[PDB]
DNA sequence: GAGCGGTGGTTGGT
DNA sequence: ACCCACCACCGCTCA
């Protein structure tokens, strides 16, 4: 669920992470904060094959991507109300990211962080998060189009734009379409009533009128239900396309308790949100010797090769992350810039081509582990890094480069 | 989760 | 007793 929702609210805007991240960093003068439901991995991560722990491995590579976007993730886990939590939590930590346990459903807790200002956006499996208070929700972190390769884009959904848009659906309206047409907890709903007639009741306000009703008031329900049931068997207001005389409404319906599960979901306590306001983001500091230990054991990246490869794979990410904390000791991170580009894979975010020493940047020496065309972690390597990030961490190397081009 | 073609049911009109 | 378009529901397919 919700089956067929995107025909009503639109498919979302397909934008890249880079652009969302650098735009935010430009307007708000600090990195984008993202609550990531941990359910997105389950059925996207188990397609890698070979080696040791391919599921954990793609998680590893996506975390290195999150570093290179300069994004501050908080990773959210379902509570009591394939990829292993323990592992995963340990790797979230080695990367200097944050792991958060929801009291109840992760989707609900995410939306709640966003609406409390702990994060600026939710990245989820779908837009269920909108029924839960979400305003800016992402889905489908994935390669762009048929270009089969790097996962660079997400699909962005904007609750305020949807509610104003052709479908008019808002949080209270969708919730009504979930009750009748089916959701996670009540996959049935009103039998025989699907998305098209449910969206027609939502734009007739029936979703507002019910989310405003307490469950105690029993008198108010019947007036609402009898009213709704009457427009259904008659279509007196023209609320719908046709008339549904045989569309049976169950006695239980509406199930307020299931309704309340959306309108007042089990989310963290106020004290938890307070703790979060002060502890997130934390000191984003990647544990280098920790990742080394992890990768040797988890991925069988053993001895010098493994060390080399961990250096190559993590150095561009560590450069971005170092830039956003930070005579000319800018050189400790960047040796030079060679070129500029506004590539479509970032919706044309300006990038500069930075030269750097991988092994020096990471801090590992491969000669201190056993030795058993090639990549030399002491030669310069070259990454494309967003300009806006370079001007914050290495301002004078950008200026020098900028003067070189004028000349 | 989401798309897609099929199937069977409801409505309004032939 | 038929069509007709629309819809809702099913089963499969890809992750
Ligand atoms: Cs239904
Ligand atoms: Mg869901």
Tab-separated table of C-alpha atoms (C1' of nucleotides) and ligand atoms in Angstrom:
chain	number	residue	atom	x	y	z
A	1	UNK	CA	0.000	0.000	0.000
A	2	UNK	CA	-1.170	2.428	-0.922
A	3	UNK	CA	-2.026	0.650	-4.178
A	4	UNK	CA	-2.254	3.112	-7.053
A	5	UNK	CA	-1.404	6.218	-5.028
A	6	UNK	CA	0.973	7.786	-7.560
A	7	UNK	CA	-1.699	8.027	-10.245
A	8	UNK	CA	-3.395	10.495	-7.848
A	9	UNK	CA	-0.584	12.482	-6.189
A	10	UNK	CA	1.850	12.231	-9.101
A	11	UNK	CA	5.047	10.215	-9.289
A	12	UNK	CA	7.261	12.734	-7.504
A	13	UNK	CA	10.179	14.729	-8.830
A	14	UNK	CA	13.213	12.616	-9.706
A	15	UNK	CA	16.185	14.534	-8.350
A	16	UNK	CA	19.718	13.507	-7.344
A	17	UNK	CA	20.988	13.375	-3.814
A	18	UNK	CA	23.859	15.675	-4.614
A	19	UNK	CA	21.560	18.528	-5.678
A	20	UNK	CA	19.249	18.218	-2.675
A	21	UNK	CA	22.319	18.122	-0.425
A	22	UNK	CA	24.206	21.058	-1.924
A	23	UNK	CA	21.106	23.238	-2.320
A	24	UNK	CA	20.281	22.751	1.352
A	25	UNK	CA	23.882	23.439	2.348
A	26	UNK	CA	23.699	26.698	0.369
A	27	UNK	CA	20.400	28.037	1.759
A	28	UNK	CA	20.707	26.894	5.394
A	29	UNK	CA	24.528	27.071	5.776
A	30	UNK	CA	24.836	23.540	7.184
A	31	UNK	CA	24.590	19.979	5.807
A	32	UNK	CA	21.248	18.363	5.020
A	33	UNK	CA	19.916	16.121	7.819
A	34	UNK	CA	18.091	12.991	6.677
A	35	UNK	CA	16.090	10.400	8.612
A	36	UNK	CA	16.452	7.092	6.843
A	37	UNK	CA	14.050	4.316	7.506
A	38	UNK	CA	16.019	1.146	7.679
A	39	UNK	CA	13.484	-0.869	5.730
A	40	UNK	CA	14.773	0.413	2.405
A	41	UNK	CA	17.687	-1.893	2.475
A	42	UNK	CA	15.880	-5.233	2.904
A	43	UNK	CA	14.706	-5.662	-0.655
A	44	UNK	CA	17.364	-3.728	-2.599
A	45	UNK	CA	20.477	-4.907	-0.823
A	46	UNK	CA	20.068	-8.653	-1.242
A	47	UNK	CA	20.876	-8.648	-4.936
A	48	UNK	CA	24.606	-8.400	-4.553
A	49	UNK	CA	26.341	-11.744	-5.018
A	50	UNK	CA	29.693	-13.240	-4.088
A	51	UNK	CA	32.261	-12.404	-1.421
A	52	UNK	CA	31.563	-12.188	2.299
A	53	UNK	CA	28.305	-10.479	3.351
A	54	UNK	CA	27.178	-8.803	0.100
A	55	UNK	CA	24.163	-7.300	1.914
A	56	UNK	CA	26.412	-5.593	4.471
A	57	UNK	CA	28.782	-4.659	1.647
A	58	UNK	CA	26.313	-2.531	-0.330
A	59	UNK	CA	25.386	-0.847	2.948
A	60	UNK	CA	29.099	-0.094	3.270
A	61	UNK	CA	29.261	1.426	-0.189
A	62	UNK	CA	26.110	3.510	0.317
A	63	UNK	CA	27.553	4.886	3.547
A	64	UNK	CA	30.660	6.019	1.648
A	65	UNK	CA	28.250	7.654	-0.789
A	66	UNK	CA	26.466	9.471	2.048
A	67	UNK	CA	29.839	10.808	3.200
A	68	UNK	CA	30.618	12.185	-0.277
A	69	UNK	CA	27.287	13.991	-0.359
A	70	UNK	CA	28.111	15.624	2.975
A	71	UNK	CA	24.828	14.334	4.404
A	72	UNK	CA	24.177	13.757	8.113
A	73	UNK	CA	22.011	10.604	8.315
A	74	UNK	CA	20.030	9.326	11.236
A	75	UNK	CA	19.100	5.681	10.583
A	76	UNK	CA	15.785	4.626	12.122
A	77	UNK	CA	14.835	1.098	13.247
A	78	UNK	CA	11.373	-0.367	13.920
A	79	UNK	CA	10.463	-0.914	17.547
A	80	UNK	CA	8.341	-3.541	19.302
A	81	UNK	CA	4.926	-1.784	18.735
A	82	UNK	CA	18.795	-10.120	5.344
A	83	UNK	CA	20.687	-7.261	7.058
A	84	UNK	CA	21.532	-7.665	10.763
A	85	UNK	CA	20.737	-4.865	13.232
A	86	UNK	CA	23.870	-5.622	15.274
A	87	UNK	CA	26.271	-5.487	12.332
A	88	UNK	CA	24.445	-2.568	10.833
A	89	UNK	CA	24.439	-0.612	14.074
A	90	UNK	CA	28.157	-1.264	14.458
A	91	UNK	CA	28.806	-0.010	10.943
A	92	UNK	CA	26.552	3.035	11.398
A	93	UNK	CA	28.780	3.863	14.341
A	94	UNK	CA	32.165	3.305	12.678
A	95	UNK	CA	31.026	5.760	10.034
A	96	UNK	CA	30.183	8.377	12.640
A	97	UNK	CA	26.515	8.242	11.754
A	98	UNK	CA	23.593	8.008	14.149
A	99	UNK	CA	21.329	5.069	14.842
A	100	UNK	CA	17.915	5.627	16.363
A	101	UNK	CA	15.382	3.074	17.591
A	102	UNK	CA	11.732	3.981	17.099
A	103	UNK	CA	9.269	3.087	19.870
A	104	UNK	CA	6.814	1.897	17.229
A	105	UNK	CA	6.889	2.036	13.461
A	106	UNK	CA	9.961	3.537	11.849
A	107	UNK	CA	7.972	5.336	9.113
A	108	UNK	CA	5.966	7.152	11.824
A	109	UNK	CA	9.037	8.023	13.909
A	110	UNK	CA	10.860	9.420	10.837
A	111	UNK	CA	8.030	11.778	9.910
A	112	UNK	CA	7.974	12.789	13.545
A	113	UNK	CA	11.688	13.740	13.533
A	114	UNK	CA	11.143	15.816	10.425
A	115	UNK	CA	8.281	17.644	11.923
A	116	UNK	CA	10.227	18.383	15.074
A	117	UNK	CA	13.137	19.799	13.155
A	118	UNK	CA	15.547	17.004	14.045
A	119	UNK	CA	15.825	16.272	10.289
A	120	UNK	CA	15.007	18.138	7.100
A	121	UNK	CA	13.704	15.179	5.084
A	122	UNK	CA	12.624	11.533	5.258
A	123	UNK	CA	13.997	8.828	2.919
A	124	UNK	CA	11.523	5.907	3.135
A	125	UNK	CA	10.202	2.902	1.167
A	126	UNK	CA	7.072	4.783	0.071
A	127	UNK	CA	4.907	7.771	0.911
A	128	UNK	CA	3.079	6.132	3.888
A	129	UNK	CA	5.105	8.703	5.818
A	130	UNK	CA	2.734	11.425	4.588
A	131	UNK	CA	-0.158	10.013	6.613
A	132	UNK	CA	2.216	10.251	9.541
A	133	UNK	CA	3.057	13.985	9.337
A	134	UNK	CA	5.892	13.934	6.798
A	135	UNK	CA	6.284	17.021	4.573
A	136	UNK	CA	9.277	16.242	2.330
A	137	UNK	CA	9.629	12.522	1.714
A	138	UNK	CA	12.138	10.709	-0.474
A	139	UNK	CA	11.931	7.242	-1.957
A	140	UNK	CA	13.861	5.035	-4.407
A	141	UNK	CA	17.525	5.888	-3.897
A	142	UNK	CA	18.667	4.344	-7.176
A	143	UNK	CA	20.528	4.748	-10.479
A	144	UNK	CA	19.019	7.277	-12.844
A	145	UNK	CA	16.860	5.873	-15.624
A	146	UNK	CA	18.414	3.108	-17.687
A	147	UNK	CA	21.916	4.447	-16.948
A	148	UNK	CA	22.625	1.258	-14.989
A	149	UNK	CA	25.185	2.115	-12.360
A	150	UNK	CA	25.757	4.537	-9.496
A	151	UNK	CA	22.740	5.302	-7.342
A	152	UNK	CA	22.581	9.090	-7.652
A	153	UNK	CA	18.874	10.084	-7.541
A	154	UNK	CA	15.789	9.858	-5.332
A	155	UNK	CA	12.137	10.490	-6.009
A	156	UNK	CA	10.972	13.496	-4.009
A	157	UNK	CA	7.403	13.954	-2.800
A	158	UNK	CA	6.163	17.227	-1.293
A	159	UNK	CA	3.120	16.950	0.974
A	160	UNK	CA	2.226	20.655	0.665
A	161	UNK	CA	2.445	20.533	-3.137
A	162	UNK	CA	0.360	17.335	-3.233
A	163	UNK	CA	-2.402	18.802	-1.058
A	164	UNK	CA	-2.646	21.820	-3.316
A	165	UNK	CA	-2.178	19.767	-6.480
A	166	UNK	CA	-4.829	18.128	-8.643
A	167	UNK	CA	-5.552	15.338	-6.130
A	168	UNK	CA	-5.919	17.724	-3.175
A	169	UNK	CA	-4.998	14.852	-0.869
A	170	UNK	CA	-3.481	15.811	2.482
A	171	UNK	CA	-2.553	13.763	5.548
A	172	UNK	CA	-6.185	13.483	6.694
A	173	UNK	CA	-7.376	12.640	3.172
A	174	UNK	CA	-4.931	9.829	2.505
A	175	UNK	CA	-5.651	8.385	5.882
A	176	UNK	CA	-9.295	8.115	4.831
A	177	UNK	CA	-8.196	6.372	1.583
A	178	UNK	CA	-6.091	3.979	3.692
A	179	UNK	CA	-9.070	3.109	5.915
A	180	UNK	CA	-11.427	2.245	3.070
A	181	UNK	CA	-9.119	1.065	0.328
A	182	UNK	CA	-6.539	-0.667	2.540
A	183	UNK	CA	-3.249	-0.033	4.304
A	184	UNK	CA	-0.753	-2.079	6.273
A	185	UNK	CA	-2.871	-2.797	9.397
A	186	UNK	CA	-6.217	-3.106	7.621
A	187	UNK	CA	-5.215	-4.370	4.155
A	188	UNK	CA	-8.918	-4.810	3.358
A	189	UNK	CA	-10.815	-1.701	4.393
A	190	UNK	CA	-14.278	-1.287	2.914
A	191	UNK	CA	-14.555	-4.379	0.683
A	192	UNK	CA	-15.115	-3.501	-2.942
A	193	UNK	CA	-14.060	0.140	-2.396
A	194	UNK	CA	-10.708	1.008	-3.918
A	195	UNK	CA	-8.606	4.052	-4.564
A	196	UNK	CA	-10.846	5.907	-7.022
A	197	UNK	CA	-13.977	6.115	-4.877
A	198	UNK	CA	-11.886	6.675	-1.720
A	199	UNK	CA	-10.048	9.648	-3.221
A	200	UNK	CA	-13.477	10.970	-4.162
A	201	UNK	CA	-14.530	10.899	-0.512
A	202	UNK	CA	-11.316	12.625	0.580
A	203	UNK	CA	-11.805	15.571	-1.790
A	204	UNK	CA	-15.344	15.827	-0.307
A	205	UNK	CA	-13.700	16.640	3.051
A	206	UNK	CA	-14.730	13.371	4.747
A	207	UNK	CA	-11.101	12.869	5.867
A	208	UNK	CA	-10.896	16.180	7.676
A	209	UNK	CA	-14.234	15.641	9.367
A	210	UNK	CA	-13.101	12.314	10.795
A	211	UNK	CA	-9.537	13.049	11.972
A	212	UNK	CA	-11.122	15.866	14.090
A	213	UNK	CA	-13.374	13.331	15.920
A	214	UNK	CA	-12.429	11.748	19.214
A	215	UNK	CA	-13.219	8.047	19.585
A	216	UNK	CA	-15.248	8.557	22.723
A	217	UNK	CA	-17.737	10.727	20.953
A	218	UNK	CA	-19.729	7.884	19.408
A	219	UNK	CA	-22.544	10.146	18.504
A	220	UNK	CA	-20.349	12.081	16.089
A	221	UNK	CA	-19.213	9.028	14.261
A	222	UNK	CA	-22.694	7.860	13.390
A	223	UNK	CA	-23.593	11.309	11.969
A	224	UNK	CA	-20.435	11.249	9.851
A	225	UNK	CA	-20.863	7.612	8.807
A	226	UNK	CA	-24.585	7.975	8.075
A	227	UNK	CA	-23.797	11.116	6.080
A	228	UNK	CA	-20.984	9.411	4.148
A	229	UNK	CA	-23.095	6.280	3.667
A	230	UNK	CA	-25.890	8.478	2.285
A	231	UNK	CA	-23.776	10.288	-0.312
A	232	UNK	CA	-22.557	6.812	-1.326
A	233	UNK	CA	-25.967	5.250	-1.943
A	234	UNK	CA	-27.288	8.459	-3.571
A	235	UNK	CA	-24.435	10.759	-4.718
A	236	UNK	CA	-26.675	13.688	-3.780
A	237	UNK	CA	-23.836	16.216	-3.721
A	238	UNK	CA	-22.240	14.780	-6.857
A	239	UNK	CA	-19.299	13.778	-4.658
A	240	UNK	CA	-18.681	10.834	-6.939
A	241	UNK	CA	-18.776	9.523	-10.429
A	242	UNK	CA	-21.447	6.955	-9.954
A	243	UNK	CA	-23.601	5.663	-7.167
A	244	UNK	CA	-22.770	2.665	-5.057
A	245	UNK	CA	-25.920	1.111	-3.685
A	246	UNK	CA	-24.340	-2.307	-3.045
A	247	UNK	CA	-20.992	-1.046	-1.677
A	248	UNK	CA	-21.382	-2.523	1.820
A	249	UNK	CA	-19.818	-0.585	4.707
A	250	UNK	CA	-18.709	-2.949	7.510
A	251	UNK	CA	-20.129	-2.459	10.994
A	252	UNK	CA	-16.639	-1.995	12.483
A	253	UNK	CA	-15.845	0.761	9.967
A	254	UNK	CA	-14.398	3.176	10.611
A	255	UNK	CA	-11.899	1.647	13.024
A	256	UNK	CA	-10.834	4.714	15.025
A	257	UNK	CA	-8.193	2.713	16.751
A	258	UNK	CA	-6.633	2.045	13.344
A	259	UNK	CA	-7.366	5.685	12.530
A	260	UNK	CA	-5.541	6.795	15.683
A	261	UNK	CA	-2.581	4.620	14.594
A	262	UNK	CA	-2.112	7.254	11.874
A	263	UNK	CA	-3.347	10.463	13.500
A	264	UNK	CA	-1.487	9.943	16.812
A	265	UNK	CA	1.140	7.276	16.075
A	266	UNK	CA	3.365	5.842	18.780
A	267	UNK	CA	6.493	8.000	18.400
A	268	UNK	CA	9.332	8.918	20.764
A	269	UNK	CA	8.786	10.741	24.038
A	270	UNK	CA	9.346	14.524	24.326
A	271	UNK	CA	12.475	13.841	26.410
A	272	UNK	CA	13.800	11.705	23.543
A	273	UNK	CA	13.243	14.518	21.032
A	274	UNK	CA	15.047	16.832	23.438
A	275	UNK	CA	18.063	14.505	23.754
A	276	UNK	CA	18.105	14.279	19.929
A	277	UNK	CA	18.057	18.064	19.463
A	278	UNK	CA	21.357	18.227	21.334
A	279	UNK	CA	23.064	14.988	20.231
A	280	UNK	CA	22.327	15.016	16.564
A	281	UNK	CA	24.401	15.578	14.520
A	282	UNK	CA	27.256	14.135	16.478
A	283	UNK	CA	30.930	14.458	15.935
A	284	UNK	CA	30.986	12.878	12.545
A	285	UNK	CA	34.307	11.147	12.856
A	286	UNK	CA	34.919	8.013	10.911
A	287	UNK	CA	36.705	5.308	12.912
A	288	UNK	CA	39.493	4.437	10.456
A	289	UNK	CA	41.115	1.614	12.433
A	290	UNK	CA	37.593	0.435	13.276
A	291	UNK	CA	36.466	0.199	9.647
A	292	UNK	CA	39.712	-1.623	8.894
A	293	UNK	CA	38.988	-4.226	11.587
A	294	UNK	CA	35.375	-4.493	10.409
A	295	UNK	CA	36.249	-4.931	6.722
A	296	UNK	CA	38.978	-7.512	7.321
A	297	UNK	CA	36.575	-9.620	9.296
A	298	UNK	CA	33.256	-8.825	7.639
A	299	UNK	CA	34.318	-8.686	3.978
A	300	UNK	CA	37.502	-10.774	4.118
A	301	UNK	CA	39.548	-7.744	2.954
A	302	UNK	CA	42.614	-9.261	4.472
A	303	UNK	CA	46.229	-8.077	4.562
A	304	UNK	CA	47.684	-5.389	2.288
A	305	UNK	CA	45.137	-5.776	-0.609
A	306	UNK	CA	42.196	-5.253	1.732
A	307	UNK	CA	43.921	-2.271	3.321
A	308	UNK	CA	44.656	-0.775	-0.118
A	309	UNK	CA	41.134	-1.251	-1.278
A	310	UNK	CA	39.619	0.259	1.844
A	311	UNK	CA	41.830	3.315	1.296
A	312	UNK	CA	40.745	3.735	-2.339
A	313	UNK	CA	37.057	3.177	-1.543
A	314	UNK	CA	36.845	5.544	1.447
A	315	UNK	CA	39.246	8.374	0.596
A	316	UNK	CA	36.893	10.534	-1.550
A	317	UNK	CA	34.226	10.220	1.149
A	318	UNK	CA	36.648	11.232	3.894
A	319	UNK	CA	37.715	14.281	1.908
A	320	UNK	CA	34.177	15.697	1.769
A	321	UNK	CA	33.563	14.993	5.435
A	322	UNK	CA	36.845	16.629	6.467
A	323	UNK	CA	36.030	19.694	4.348
A	324	UNK	CA	32.789	20.442	6.227
A	325	UNK	CA	34.388	20.607	9.649
A	326	UNK	CA	37.400	22.683	8.527
A	327	UNK	CA	50.307	29.016	5.981
A	328	UNK	CA	48.543	26.947	3.264
A	329	UNK	CA	47.890	23.690	5.094
A	330	UNK	CA	44.748	23.277	3.006
A	331	UNK	CA	47.120	20.966	1.096
A	332	UNK	CA	46.700	18.342	3.827
A	333	UNK	CA	43.370	17.505	2.105
A	334	UNK	CA	43.760	18.730	-1.491
A	335	UNK	CA	46.834	19.007	-3.698
A	336	UNK	CA	45.258	20.754	-6.705
A	337	UNK	CA	42.259	21.442	-8.917
A	338	UNK	CA	42.427	20.684	-12.641
A	339	UNK	CA	38.947	21.387	-14.066
A	340	UNK	CA	35.291	22.338	-13.542
A	341	UNK	CA	32.046	20.649	-14.596
A	342	UNK	CA	28.250	20.953	-14.367
A	343	UNK	CA	27.290	17.329	-15.066
A	344	UNK	CA	23.682	16.201	-15.493
A	345	UNK	CA	24.160	13.353	-13.002
A	346	UNK	CA	24.066	16.019	-10.264
A	347	UNK	CA	21.391	18.142	-12.014
A	348	UNK	CA	24.398	20.356	-12.868
A	349	UNK	CA	25.844	21.046	-9.392
A	350	UNK	CA	29.253	22.646	-10.035
A	351	UNK	CA	32.106	20.260	-9.264
A	352	UNK	CA	35.869	20.676	-9.281
A	353	UNK	CA	38.390	17.956	-10.043
A	354	UNK	CA	40.477	17.600	-6.902
A	355	UNK	CA	43.809	15.783	-6.633
A	356	UNK	CA	44.608	14.021	-3.359
A	357	UNK	CA	46.829	11.363	-1.783
A	358	UNK	CA	44.493	8.491	-0.736
A	359	UNK	CA	46.783	6.733	1.750
A	360	UNK	CA	47.770	10.029	3.411
A	361	UNK	CA	44.181	11.206	3.668
A	362	UNK	CA	42.886	7.968	5.226
A	363	UNK	CA	45.755	7.467	7.701
A	364	UNK	CA	46.481	3.795	6.958
A	365	UNK	CA	49.801	2.461	5.676
A	366	UNK	CA	49.505	-0.771	3.641
A	367	UNK	CA	53.167	-1.700	4.250
A	368	UNK	CA	52.375	-2.356	7.934
A	369	UNK	CA	50.156	-5.323	6.937
A	370	UNK	CA	51.386	-8.573	5.375
A	371	UNK	CA	52.195	-8.556	1.685
A	372	UNK	CA	50.778	-11.484	-0.263
A	373	UNK	CA	47.934	-1.915	-13.784
A	374	UNK	CA	47.841	-1.540	-9.966
A	375	UNK	CA	46.405	1.138	-7.686
A	376	UNK	CA	49.114	2.946	-5.719
A	377	UNK	CA	47.512	4.664	-2.696
A	378	UNK	CA	50.465	7.086	-2.595
A	379	UNK	CA	50.045	8.475	-6.106
A	380	UNK	CA	47.552	11.326	-6.531
A	381	UNK	CA	43.968	10.268	-7.107
A	382	UNK	CA	41.170	12.370	-8.611
A	383	UNK	CA	37.578	12.858	-7.442
A	384	UNK	CA	34.870	15.243	-8.508
A	385	UNK	CA	33.718	17.200	-5.473
A	386	UNK	CA	30.993	19.881	-5.342
A	387	UNK	CA	32.368	23.356	-5.426
A	388	UNK	CA	30.226	24.658	-2.650
A	389	UNK	CA	31.899	22.079	-0.406
A	390	UNK	CA	35.428	23.005	-1.547
A	391	UNK	CA	34.913	26.725	-0.917
A	392	UNK	CA	34.096	25.863	2.737
A	393	UNK	CA	37.029	23.570	3.490
A	394	UNK	CA	39.804	24.633	1.159
A	395	UNK	CA	38.894	28.253	0.198
A	396	UNK	CA	42.328	29.404	-0.940
A	397	UNK	CA	43.009	26.443	-3.267
A	398	UNK	CA	39.688	27.245	-4.988
A	399	UNK	CA	40.667	30.921	-5.201
A	400	UNK	CA	44.121	30.046	-6.581
A	401	UNK	CA	42.482	27.784	-9.165
A	402	UNK	CA	39.902	30.496	-9.943
A	403	UNK	CA	42.737	32.981	-10.554
A	404	UNK	CA	44.515	30.456	-12.756
A	405	UNK	CA	41.483	30.294	-15.031
A	406	UNK	CA	41.178	34.072	-15.316
A	407	UNK	CA	44.719	33.895	-16.577
B	1	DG	C1'	6.685	-1.760	-2.841
B	2	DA	C1'	5.076	-1.131	-7.399
B	3	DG	C1'	3.796	-2.030	-12.139
B	4	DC	C1'	1.043	-4.838	-15.329
B	5	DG	C1'	-2.278	-7.865	-17.715
B	6	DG	C1'	-6.200	-10.561	-16.480
B	7	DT	C1'	-10.639	-11.520	-14.168
B	8	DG	C1'	-14.716	-10.707	-12.383
B	9	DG	C1'	-18.275	-7.225	-10.551
B	10	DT	C1'	-20.915	-2.871	-10.471
B	11	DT	C1'	-23.105	0.922	-13.069
B	12	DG	C1'	-25.375	3.117	-16.321
B	13	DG	C1'	-27.096	2.972	-20.429
B	14	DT	C1'	-28.076	-0.062	-25.375
C	1	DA	C1'	-30.377	-9.935	-22.414
C	2	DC	C1'	-26.576	-7.798	-24.129
C	3	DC	C1'	-22.583	-3.979	-24.200
C	4	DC	C1'	-19.725	-0.512	-22.121
C	5	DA	C1'	-16.148	1.800	-19.235
C	6	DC	C1'	-14.726	1.941	-15.099
C	7	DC	C1'	-13.092	0.017	-11.291
C	8	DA	C1'	-11.238	-3.314	-7.770
C	9	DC	C1'	-8.947	-7.520	-7.110
C	10	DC	C1'	-5.646	-11.221	-8.422
C	11	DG	C1'	-1.260	-13.126	-9.615
C	12	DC	C1'	3.104	-12.405	-11.424
C	13	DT	C1'	7.350	-9.949	-12.003
C	14	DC	C1'	11.271	-6.906	-10.769
C	15	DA	C1'	13.850	-5.291	-6.825
D	1	LIG	CS1	-10.567	-2.460	-0.557
D	2	LIG	MG1	4.977	0.773	4.306
